[model samples]
Target chain A: PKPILYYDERSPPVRSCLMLIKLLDIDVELRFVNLFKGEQFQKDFLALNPQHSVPTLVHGDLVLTDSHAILIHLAEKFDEGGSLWPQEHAERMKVLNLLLFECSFLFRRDSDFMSAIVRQGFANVDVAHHERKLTEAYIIMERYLENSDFMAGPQLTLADLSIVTTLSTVNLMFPLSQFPRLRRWFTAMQQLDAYEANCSGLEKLRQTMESVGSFQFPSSSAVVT
Target chain B: PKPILYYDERSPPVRSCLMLIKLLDIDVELRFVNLFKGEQFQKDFLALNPQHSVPTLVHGDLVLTDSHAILIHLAEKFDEGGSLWPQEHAERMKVLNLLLFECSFLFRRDSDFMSAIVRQGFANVDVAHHERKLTEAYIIMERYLENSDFMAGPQLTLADLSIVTTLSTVNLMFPLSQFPRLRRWFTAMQQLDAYEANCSGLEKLRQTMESVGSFQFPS
Candidate 1:
């Protein structure tokens, strides 16, 4: 049975899953959800994913939401050789931690920055807090890659696939130049075969974010904090 | 070699790891770090873990950080029969998604509230935002539990262990009485033998949180 992927190209996590699907060469039926139009809230869509996040995949009787979950599900289910997610304990642990780091740390910390962009169209009082978090993310990524070629280890795994998509989006907001090692890794990830196809939507998102002039709240009183 | 667990009992994630270790009966040496004293910033600790978060486990040559990662490593490496994480494809997928949900959604959304509590000694300016997010988390958990006894399924996997600890902390700020299903599930999780053992530190954490009046910013 062909897996069904419900996604929006502009979402970084959705792009991550798309890149993994392309990398694995998995046959999936792509379903687009117009997030701005509230397509994700359609009863059928909500039934499948209560969380209502994009990049939800339904394969056979299994339903997977959360991009990282979908990535792990596909890798564990189809990557029989254990190359993408690895079966070796130590190598696998590195990959798992890398995935968790992105899900738990990077994504969490960057929420305010992304929200500010969508809400105010620019960084406001929230800018400094999120920028500092993003920089810390970069610092950690730089340190992680100090002795290794990839985010987790020497090989290209789901960690690279998951993180590169996010890093690409983050780089659009905060340039990655200050972290040379991380920039080098990001450059290497872009050189992969599926990188362009996977990140087409991300490029659009970058253009959209860039096109918007920074806007501040109409009044200091309107700010949430 | 006995694994060394670097943890503070006050952290929900660290407490989650402690419960799992007890459930699995893995012998490990416990080392406490006073996070308030900046012990996690020491050069030696940073050398082992760049993230420097709690519940880091060291066994032989392998060092594991991230509470979920540590849970997976211990479950995969030593659970022997795969009961904690399960090996069946469907069940494992459910457990995995639940773990991811807590990591990415529940923990992420509640972070501001936690930080505000620590920094401001109360929710302060962060109250409304965190309250909304916490309510959303409860709504989802309530929905998820409509058909099952636990967060993932009828059985208690690492998802229950992970989320119960987190929800316990969250309950400290926002009472869980509004969501009946979720409250029922939380009550049930308290029955496990490892439940109290894993959450002992959480009790102290709760007391500490309640005892303090909001601290004033030093002028």
Candidate 2:
């Protein structure tokens, strides 16, 4: 039994994990957890990881829950030979620096941006103020992407995997019609066979798309209905 | 040329790094960056770590700024072959789990608590709401600490270093004397000769205590 990967087709994190499996050629259990039905709230799942988040990698007695942490563990543990994670001092720092930004700023800002848009779309709320925050995150990535080949400077590390997954999820919510640089980056990622193979089967994703509908952010911190 | 640690006397992070130094028996340059005087904001120091936070560890070619990251890096690079960090899988996960909690929840609440008490001490704005937020954070931590031996588990990992450092800082801000378990833990940590030697001098700390006033909760 390879590590059990608790996954969902709609989750970009699941897609990222699947991509890593292909890239590293490791077998995973691929257990599907229904999100819309609130299966994650179950006590059994919560016992595995107190955080109660998804894309959880359960390997034997060791359950690495956090997405970023799981990414780090997989890269280090499954290294057949040399450096997919960049062993050089400067390069490792560079990769990790960007990876941290993905978690703290990019991922956080993406949630904020989506929440604001959802509020404006579903309910009557003014989210124009949040636009600048989104720009701040984008502007940083835009400048970096302009000079570098991938999210992390030269070599493709787990940094690219994280960035690709985040942007893929964000694309589901917002349009990538504009922001030519980001669009180009996303296009480049799509060329990868890994992304295409784990593309969440069009019909299954389309059905989920129909059920979830569109933007619906919490108006006053109430539970999402 | 080991590493330069920019820290303040009262800062919990500095104390944690100091504790690690004692445990691993490693030596590094201690450069105190006064938080009150805005020394961390200076360009020369800020260039090293953009976050401008305390306990920034700078090795020969590697520079780690985050407190948790620095703890792990130090444990791995300098310690007795990952003695403090632990090479065992479950143990590493436990430590990393708590470290993540410190980053996501504990630190957030601690900073919120500090902002509510001290920030309001200077300002006129009603910070009752922030006080509520602070209380909620403490309650969450209190609940977790009730059953666990340490933040991670029975054995001390970098998790304890992070938590101990956080408590030291929190004690400097709030009167944790009311929180019995926490007070005992702090006192126990203080008894270590390693803690005494690594932490800032007692007289220097007394000066800070005089400046910051008695550590009291706002509400």
Candidate 3:
């Protein structure tokens, strides 16, 4: 039962999945699918994922797309040590309900931030709207972070994993200090013994930052608004 | 106990929830949160859902927002017959995966569609990009419908409810025939005894189409 994470080294989704795999101390292999060059759109790969998105997981006979689903699948299937995604339906739904909100909000917000950054990186476009989206996301995240220790309340659930991954991506474009609670959570997540072992270290991410330096800025702390 | 559905008649999320409620024959009350009147953003409603989005289901102490969550909750709680959400884990995931895709892709695509449609409805500005997204969504969906009988597979799933509700909003803005398979699916879905018994009729939809006709028709 080998878990194969179809990943791109620089992808935020990949970073999150790889980190979780490391944190959980799970046996896995990283299979890179290059999206930058349109390898994801190729027929063979598209069959695995119709959406043609990265971070698709293949384990034994099962293939799951969408990082959130893969995270749940792993949590459910490999439940030997009692990892993420709780068993109780009520608690699980609470995690899921928030997870849905994250997908609906944070995922889209980070994606907007990434797209706006990429657009500005490649072409001189007015990313003002995207910047606002990023700001709104920050505000929304701040509201959530202000009340709870974690995205899914007390414990570190899949909700936290999905969101932390989004925060990690937002870090690529802007300063985290703009949202202090999130900043605190970010540091806390990094310090998780599992996080350190499973996920990419800051050094690994800094390398990508070094290469795609166009977005790397000191203003990571400033709110876009 | 009265299950309150905070919804707009035109909201696909609300419609989907309604479809589920109707199919399950559950007892509920429909409280319209008018988006056109800006009533959805009011403090009272906002307290119920910080997101201030419609299709918020309030069942006593529990309040579920996202339409997908609402459907799953209802399916598990009220569906003693297990008509929705297949019991098999793999099949359930397959349906849930598509439902996730709808929330991610279709909802966003249609949200952009609405933003533009709203502007056009109000005669504020040109809805060029919004219309473009609508067209793109139809194109992608058209290709998809060519293969599958419904949004998920052979028999109807919650995925179809989601897709139908979403495209119904789009159809209110534009014509359905542009995507023939989608149009066909729409007609086929309506023919279902469930759709007729549980949901709003074509008459109400026709009125919505005629009233909000000011929106720019995507070419």
Candidate 4:
């Protein structure tokens, strides 16, 4: 049975799974669950995952709801070269460390802000706190990239794919040319062929943000009272 | 060079590491960092993990700060039977799925409430929402356990070991005689010898919680 991946390009995590599927060069049925169209609320989609998260990977009877889990499963099942997800214990753990870091820090915070825009309206978002969290991630991630070409190490792995989706979204909100290492890493990711998957989604994101008017920094207090 | 696990029993995630170590019959230097005395702020511990989280396992040159990360590393490196952390792809994903669920849901919510208690007074804590959350976890978890004996499947894996510590803590704050299947699973966890490590830590939890006043249910 072909692996069916339910995804919406608008989601950063879903884009990570799509990038991996492309990078792996494996055929997976890409089923779109449009968040903008309210497709996620449909009962059939709800049954597949009650939580109805995008990037839900359905493989036969098994359903993976989390993107991190999906990334590893795809890597383990495909990626015969194991370059994307190395088999060596130390190497693998390092990749998982970065993946976990992104989930715990970058992805979670971004979800809150995105929810504010999508559910409540842009004015309801606290842009100031968003600025602080983005900086916190950039500062910590610079150290990870200081010596290595990629997140886990010199080779490009799932961690790079996983972090880029979230980091790219964060950069769109808070631009930084200051963190040279992080900037270097982002540029490196953009050059990859599989990175094409994020293009449309990011365009959608930009438009969504623009619909609420051009984003303003918090210091001027344009977004805050 | 053996692994060195930095832990404090009062923490649920750290106790999961201890429970796994005892169950695996493996030996690692258990370095206790007393949170009660504010030892987590010490320079050396901070150096080990900038975040200064408990159950921070130092393996030679590698440092694992997240408890879920530590659980898999131990099982992969050890777990000869492969029962705790299986190698099969689909099976592994199921376990990882549940493990991630616990982290994204049970543990994260628990951390916020625990922070409210540790960093703020009881009067400042919100018990009604806490009650809703605990039941929320219970309702979803009941569906997972309705068919299987364990979280991932009939055979207990790292997911079961990882979830119990957090679930146990949730129960202490809001006791539930309902959710019969979940209670059965909790009792099953307690019956294990590895569970002994959780007792004293939970005792400490009870005292700390009692200090604020007995835990009150929301309606």
Candidate 5:
């Protein structure tokens, strides 16, 4: 019997988990939770995860909520060779540190723009403020890429796997072209088998953003929807 | 030679690291970075960590920035028995999950209030908004405590140490007396040897919060 993954494909976090699962080539049940319809608020789902967030992995008695936790757990338990998640102390630390950076800073910063655009419409959102913060985040990533081909190291690790999903969705709003090094790194990530797995969901997200008239910046500030 | 810990005691994240170092009883040469003075932005510090955040740990060749990372690194490297960070896979997962919860949600939510109060002054800040979000954070903690004596399990772990520092400062604004289970657990946490080590710094934070008029909530 396969473990159940409660997820919504539209979510970047969920998509990241899916990509990893695909990359790991493991068998798992994908139980979709329609976040737009508030299925995540259902009692059964809440019981499994008090956090009530998507990308929840349930394997028998074990329940992993955070996507990073699920990624590491899968890599540790299944990746017998320990390639995706390095076993070396220093290397593992670098991967973990970058993953934390993704969770605590990068993803959060991206979400700020997404939520603001969803809540107030793109016209009313403080685009300047969001763009400034996002630019800062980009600059950091660009700096990080100056030394390594991937976010963590020379090879594609969980750090690359997790961040690629985030950047794929985030790139819709803020393109990677501005930062050449990051853009080059992103180009390399796009060539991976996992990135191919992520496309359909990315398209879904882009269409939703377009439907809301998010990409078309207002001349002075006119509400589109 | 002791590892150099770059920290500011007033910061909850920094205090969490200090508490963990104290718990492990590891020798560390404390290097205070006055965040208020923008010392963290200096070129040398930025070279170590681009984030320019306090609670950066410099252990020989390793430079750890995140407090949670620093805590785990210390526990894994120093704690021979792996008690602070359990060796069991299931237990370790629970602890890591809780730590992520702290970093991504609880601590972030509390910082909203701190930032609001600091930026707008307590009188001008949106008290109701902050209190509502804070109440939600408290509910989550309370619910988690209903099952076990600590955040992760019956035995004290890094989860408790990390959360205690966040809660210590957070409790000053929203008293823990309202939540019995959380208060009980927090009281037990206070009895730990590490809490005594965190006292002077905690006191400094209290005074700073007091001077800013954050303690005097609207009656």
Candidate 6:
């Protein structure tokens, strides 16, 4: 049986895996789990992933749910040169650090905005605190690009692929111009063929968030929760 | 010229590395950062870690800020048997999945409770929601331990060492009685000598949070 990737195009995390699959160009079945239709809750999907997160990859005996883990596993198993996932211990450590940062902080903060919008609708969601968190996240990301062309180092590794999708999600809400270096990298990333993976979801992101005052900031951002 | 681990006993993430170091029995020097005194903000510390988080490991030319990353690096470089961290791709995939879970959801929810208490003080903080987040987190943990003896598998991997400390931190705030499976795993983990690494920090955890309301559910 070939490897199967279960994902919804709208999810930012799912987009990262799709980007990697594009880069690897390996033979893997792409299965769509329509999250909006409650397909992930079905017995088959739950048996594959109890958490029922998008971008679950089932390759033979291996079943991976987290997109970050899926990225590394795909690279490790396929990328012969270790360019996507560095073979050396030190370089891998650096990439892992950023991957976790994206999961724990960068993406977490983005969820604060997305979850708020989904739960409260754009009319009632708090904007100020999310704006600050986004801006602060960009400050940290901008610093990473200051030393290198990519998030981890000079190379375009998995860190760049995984982080770019989440950053793009927040960029739709918070302006990207606030950080020059980040925008610079975003421009450079646009040249890569892998960038096409995000095209579909980015459209959905902009389309969905179009009514969120589209460039307007709320007065007196609600105090940090 | 040695690996230096800068940490505060009060922080749960730092405690995970301590347990791993003890298990591997490596030669990494343990240096306390004294976060209670705001030592992490100093210029010297800033150069090493811009965010100034504890449990920063400086080993020769490589410096790592994330403890989960540190645990994997140490096990990869030191755990020759691959017992602490499985070398097989399939097994490694399983472990990394849990590591992300601990960092993203389990630890994220715990921070919601801890940050609230730290900012609002235990007296003024909202307990109901925090308790719900915590109990839900435990439900997932209990599920992870359903078939395997440890988190990643039947063996004790880095996931167990990294996850157990965080679980212990929450177990204090939200009693361990609700999830029998997770509690079973915690007792088995305590049998290891590495469990000693958590003793000092756990005591400080109770002592610091004691005055707020010890073991009493809020109305």
lDDT (Cα, tens digit) per residue for candidate 3, span B1-219: 677888775667777888888788888887887776789789888766777788788877667778888888888888855736777666677677777777877788777655554556636545466667666667656666776888666678887887777776666556767778888888898887567532463335445544574533442
Across B1-219, the per-residue lDDT of candidate 1 in tens digits comes to 888999999888888888998888888899998765678989999888878788888988777889998988888877968667988878988898999998888877666676777777663556777889889889989999999988888888999988988888888778887999998899898989889765678777766655452533211
User: Per-candidate DockQ versus the true complex?
Assistant: 0.74, 0.25, 0.46, 0.65, 0.69, 0.71
Tens digits of per-residue lDDT, candidate 2, B1-219, equal: 687777775666566777888877888888889876789889888666555677777777666666766777778768746646778766787687667666655665566455444454525434465455445545545555676656665666787777766656655545665666666666766776666643563335545544454443342
CAPRI grade, predicted model 3: acceptable
Docking class of 6: medium
- Residue pair clashes in candidate 3: A19-A198, A19-A199, A22-A198, A23-A194, A23-A198, A174-A220, A175-A220, A175-A221
Task: For each candidate in turn, give its C-alpha RMSD to the true structure in angstroms.
Answer: 5.3, 6.5, 4.1, 3.8, 3.6, 4.1
If both were scored by TM-score, which would come out higher, candidate 3 or candidate 6?
6
Kept native contacts, fraction for each prediction: 0.89, 0.09, 0.30, 0.55, 0.50, 0.73
Better of 2 and 6 by TM-score: 6
Interface RMSD of each: 1.1, 3.2, 1.8, 1.3, 1.0, 1.3
What pairs collide in candidate 5? Answer: none
Q: Report how far residue B100 has shifted in candidate 2, in Å.
A: 2.0
Error of 5 at B57 (Å): 1.2
TM-score of chain B of each: 0.92, 0.78, 0.82, 0.93, 0.93, 0.93
lDDT of 1 by residue, A71-148 (tens): 999998778767789878889888988999888777766656776676676744467777788888888899899978
Residues A93-198 of candidate 5: C-alpha lDDT, one tens digit per residue:
8888888888877888888788788778888889888878888888878877998888888898998888878877776766555798887888787777877777
C-alpha lDDT score of every prediction, in listed order: 0.81, 0.64, 0.69, 0.81, 0.81, 0.81
**Top candidate (TM-score):** 5
Model 6: per-residue Cα lDDT over B1-219, one tens digit each: 668999887778899999988887888888888775679989889767766688899998787888889889889888867777887878888999898878877788887787777667777778888888778778877888888999999788988888888888888767778789988898998899999999899778667656443333321
Candidate 5 Cα misplacement greater than 4 A, ranges: A212-225, B210-219
Better of 1 and 3 by DockQ: 1
Per-residue accuracy of model 4 over B1-219 as CA lDDT, tens digit each: 799998889888888898999998878998989877779879888766655578789899888878889999999888856888987878889999988888777787787677677667667778687778667778778778888999899998999988999888887776658888898998998899988878889778768766654454232
Tens-digit per-residue lDDT, B1-219, candidate 5: 467899989888888888888877889999989876789999999878888888888887777788888888888888968767998988888898888888878888887778777677877878888888878888888988877999998889898888988888788778887899999998998898888767777777777766675566321
Kindly list the per-residue Cα lDDT of model 2 for residues A78-159, writing each as its tens digit.
8633365777745666666666666655666665554444444433434444445555556666666777778766666777
